[PDB]
Design a protein around this ligand. Structure first.
Ligand code: PRX
Length: 610
């Protein structure tokens, strides 16, 4: 009967009472009244609200002159202008100064019972001497550095060492093919790459150095490749280009100065798939991105310095950027770097890790939850006494999965926080606040501070006022962690995000706002599909399928899937005939695996006449 049909007869759920009784500290907010007061200030007077938030959470070398200049339509937004700071100083130095022996990183290795814990002082040493390696090899402020690493603590060392010297890290998910790594390394114009000899995940060997070698044959500007010895396997070696991480860092001091950066110096590039064209290098700058990361870590995930935060996302994606690395380290707590899968050695692994390390917040994709729920509740039998926040990201956590997460995983003692955001927003933008916001199963709830959502008519672009409305999700105002450009193509950034509905930021998602103002995310309205947590471009996959000599035309679509959220399905029209039609279906799948990576392979390729 309502316009937003998903909300029909869905009541809110309060934060469990025991959450407050068992809390080691207390929430950073007194309740929803204070959220509403701070939220209104963040919209009505963002100059005052964000200046105080930034000065609360981020240590500047030089205080900023003005909170924000520019406009959405101008595509000229700048935050904390005139400030100077360094991201590695805020993630590492200031904490090592105060509490050097506090654990910063818990490394959980692919095999249980391995791994190690890393203090803030140890982190400062490893970041410093890795930064010395890059500096000695000629990396300078403003250079991009390609990173092709699995989930080991050396990945955090690498991001933060780039930030320490003002280089711009460009992390490439270690499941990408050599073609995909090559394309991102070329576009970023990186001259330095960091990788492993091999990766280990779920007991399986990933031949990272071999993949890198293949990519670098076509990246002539890459003059050094720093290799971390993860497995010790014999790998191909290029004298004069390749260097061993362990050999190089032993040469250099255990401390390096931090480079003084402008608030608006680029911090990183993250190549992201869009509705049209090759992946775009989404650029985040420094102060605004860090402010958003710290602000959401604090108020969304209820992070306090003593906490042990565990995000299951990969450093290759924005979730790992913001919530494995930047947010928890900015706030000075402990973060978990998890090398394995939730199924290795068995389906208990996530809970084994949470129980061993006394994790307080866990951040998961619903695809992983559905896999585990299907495996059966006998794999979950873990006290997990400290687990009080259960975050979810990537798609709506639907009622059946929500209930399982709340009751079986959380024992009705944790607050489930469904966080809506995207690579381009830097940090959470519509989400409940942990320990504060009442929630609805399947809803992202309410906007974060500084986020002013509107629902637009898809055709006319007109704003649809009031509640129980549906349409396009857009934001009316800039926010600190917004992506600042697409690398090398500001015009595409303008045309993609800011020129579609002038005066607004276009998310590419549909949404409903229900009778109580709660937001229900409908998903992408463009040709972007989200498959097992992977943001994929159907146009990219079609182009991959066309690379096959038999295929003339290709069409790929995303369809609902009970486990992967959505499944990509591909249709091809052949140029002639193929008596090995079942055999062609294998070559087409391998073609996508070569062009993009295993994770992008279509479930099936249908060969049709027209
Ligand atoms: C933030 C990690 C993933 O970042 P990406 O840039 O890869 O993907 C962003 C997209 O994921 C979906 N999405 C993300 N979170 C949610 C969410 N909580 N509910 C519904 N859809 C969601 C929305 O369609 C969005 O445009």
């Amino acid at each position: 009967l309502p316009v937003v049909v998903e909300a029909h007869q869905v009541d809110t759920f309060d934060v469990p009472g025991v959450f407050y009784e068992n809390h080691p500290h207390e929430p950073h907010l007194s309740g929803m009244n204070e959220y509403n007061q701070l939220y209104q200030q963040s919209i009505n007077d963002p100059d005052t609200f964000w200046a105080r938030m930034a000065r609360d959470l981020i240590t500047f070398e030089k205080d900023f002159d003005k909170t924000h200049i520019g406009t959405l339509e101008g595509g000229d937004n700048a935050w904390f202008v005139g400030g100077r700071l360094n991201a590695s100083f805020n993630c590492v130095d200031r904490h090592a100064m105060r509490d050097p022996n506090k654990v910063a990183i818990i490394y959980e290795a692919d095999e249980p019972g391995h791994g190690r814990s890393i203090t803030y002082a140890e982190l400062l040493k490893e970041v410093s001497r890795l930064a010395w390696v890059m500096k000695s090899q000629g990396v300078r402020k403003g250079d991009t550095v390609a990173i092709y690493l699995p989930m080991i603590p050396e990945a955090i060392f690498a991001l933060l060492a780039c930030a320490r010297i003002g280089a711009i890290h460009s992390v490439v998910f270690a499941g990408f093919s050599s073609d995909s790594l090559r394309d991102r390394t070329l576009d970023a114009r990186s001259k330095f790459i960091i990788t492993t000899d091999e990766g280990k995940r779920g007991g399986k060997v990933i031949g990272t150095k071999k993949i890198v070698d293949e990519a670098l044959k076509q990246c002539p500007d890459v003059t050094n490749c720093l290799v971390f010895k993860r497995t010790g396997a014999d790998v191909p070696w290029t004298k004069g280009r390749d260097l061993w991480w362990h050999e190089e860092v032993d040469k250099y001091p255990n401390y390096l100065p931090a480079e003084s950066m402008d608030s608006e110096d680029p911090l990183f590039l993250l190549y992201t798939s869009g509705s049209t064209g090759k992946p775009k290098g989404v650029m985040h700058t420094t102060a605004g991105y860090l402010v958003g990361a710290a602000a959401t870590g604090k108020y969304v995930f209820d992070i306090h310095p003593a906490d042990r935060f565990f995000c299951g996302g990969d450093v290759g994606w924005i979730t790992g950027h913001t919530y494995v690395v930047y947010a928890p380290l900015l706030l000075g707590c402990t973060t978990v770097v998890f090398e394995s899968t939730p199924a290795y050695p068995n389906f208990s692994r996530y809970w084994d890790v949470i129980e061993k390390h006394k994790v307080t917040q866990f951040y998961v994709a619903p695809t992983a939850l559905r896999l585990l729920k299907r495996a059966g509740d006998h794999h979950i039998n873990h006290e997990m006494k400290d687990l009080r926040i259960l975050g979810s990201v990537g798609e709506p956590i639907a009622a059946e999965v929500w209930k399982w997460y709340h009751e079986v995983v959380g024992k009705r003692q944790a607050h489930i926080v469904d966080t809506y955001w995207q690579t381009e927003t830097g940090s959470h933008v519509i989400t409940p606040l942990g320990g504060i916001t009442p929630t609805k199963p399947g809803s992202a709830s309410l906007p974060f501070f500084g986020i002013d959502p509107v629902i637009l008519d898809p055709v006319t672009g007109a704003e649809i006022p009031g509640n129980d409305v549906e349409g396009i999700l857009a934001f009316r105002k800039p926010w600190p962690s917004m992506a600042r450009t697409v690398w090398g193509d500001h015009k595409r950034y303008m045309d993609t995000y800011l020129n579609v509905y002038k005066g607004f930021y276009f998310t590419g998602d549909g949404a409903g706002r229900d009778h109580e103002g709660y937001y229900w995310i409908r998903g992408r309205v463009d040709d972007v599909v989200n498959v097992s947590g992977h943001r994929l471009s159907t146009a990219e996959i079609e182009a991959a399928l066309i690379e096959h000599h038999c295929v003339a035309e290709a069409a790929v679509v995303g369809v609902p899937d009970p486990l992967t959220g959505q499944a990509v399905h591909a249709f091809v029209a052949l140029k002639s005939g193929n008596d090995n039609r079942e055999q062609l279906q294998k070559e087409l799948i391998m073609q996508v695996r070569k062009s993009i990576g295993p994770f992008a392979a279509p479930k099936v390729v249908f060969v049709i006449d027209d």
